[model samples]
Target: MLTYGAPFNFPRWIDEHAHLLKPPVGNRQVWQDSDFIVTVVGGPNHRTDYHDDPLEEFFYQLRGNAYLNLWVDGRRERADLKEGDIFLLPPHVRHSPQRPEAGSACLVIERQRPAGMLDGFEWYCDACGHLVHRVEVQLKSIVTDLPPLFESFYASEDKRRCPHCGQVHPGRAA
Candidate 1:
């Protein structure tokens, strides 16, 4: 007898749990186990830091547009996410995404980060494209762990200054 199943109804799930995804808490995790994490992510804030995840991520846009600013292999690129579009990102790529439309959301799937792997958030100079600041964190939980790093980065101007060009990237209030 088949006793186990992986059944998900997207429309019903979205209808039943849409408000839970919002700002300050940009993601609502639906399912997570030892192997995978399934979450609904909302639009990110206006920022320039490129996040580097240890594991690859899968994105499926459900509502509005999602834009990602990525820095890969010594250059910058953009990933535009539209409704009904899906994408799979490779690990260790620096990327930052933008999305803030009402009811705009995406389902993200990713493997659990391996032990001893570090997640990094990096900011580059807009004037000269120099590496400005980087925050390396040991990710314990996506919801609770990532925000504090951002809080620390945006709170200290000393951290935002570019050492190479001396350009000051002002921190946003947490």
Candidate 2:
């Protein structure tokens, strides 16, 4: 849908729909062209997962609030976003966004990855923050493709064990 160059108000649209929004509804695209994609993402009932991407990401908080936990230069960085705030993230940086319990939403903008590049998901051990597992994805259709990657991760206990800390983080429930 090309909201194109015409005047568009993303915040108003978010406010009108936040009450009924939830994850698995994931993101709603407003417009997308060769350069970038613009989407409205709703907060989840539970905190979402991490993504180590091949493309830069821009997140603009529209309604309520959200939290971002990122692993940068081998250290964890935390960012809190209030309404009207924005965050720009570099490529290949591991990060996760947590939706507020009351329900929140934001606008995310990013370029599609190039033909050979792939996006990835990574999980860390809760006790010692050691790298627990990682899975690469082609991102052919985020809706269709991502669930399977998560399914494989969640279904395997071997993948959730942290060698460094000897901790086994339990997988998410369906």
Please name the candidate that would achieve the greatest TM-score relative to the true structure: 1
Badly placed stretches (over 4 Å) of model 2 are 1-12, 15-20, 32-35
- Sliding window of 10 residues with minimal summed lDDT for model 1: 1-10
Candidate 2 TM-score, C-alpha based? 0.83
Error of 2 at 133 (Å): 0.4
Task: Report the lDDT tens digits of candidate 2 across residue range 58-121.
Answer: 9988777887888877888888888889989888887888775466678788886777888988
lDDT of 2 at 44: 68
Segments in model 1 whose C-alpha atoms lie over 4 Å from true places: 1-8
Ten consecutive residues with minimal summed lDDT in candidate 2?
A: 26-35
TM-score per candidate = 0.87, 0.83
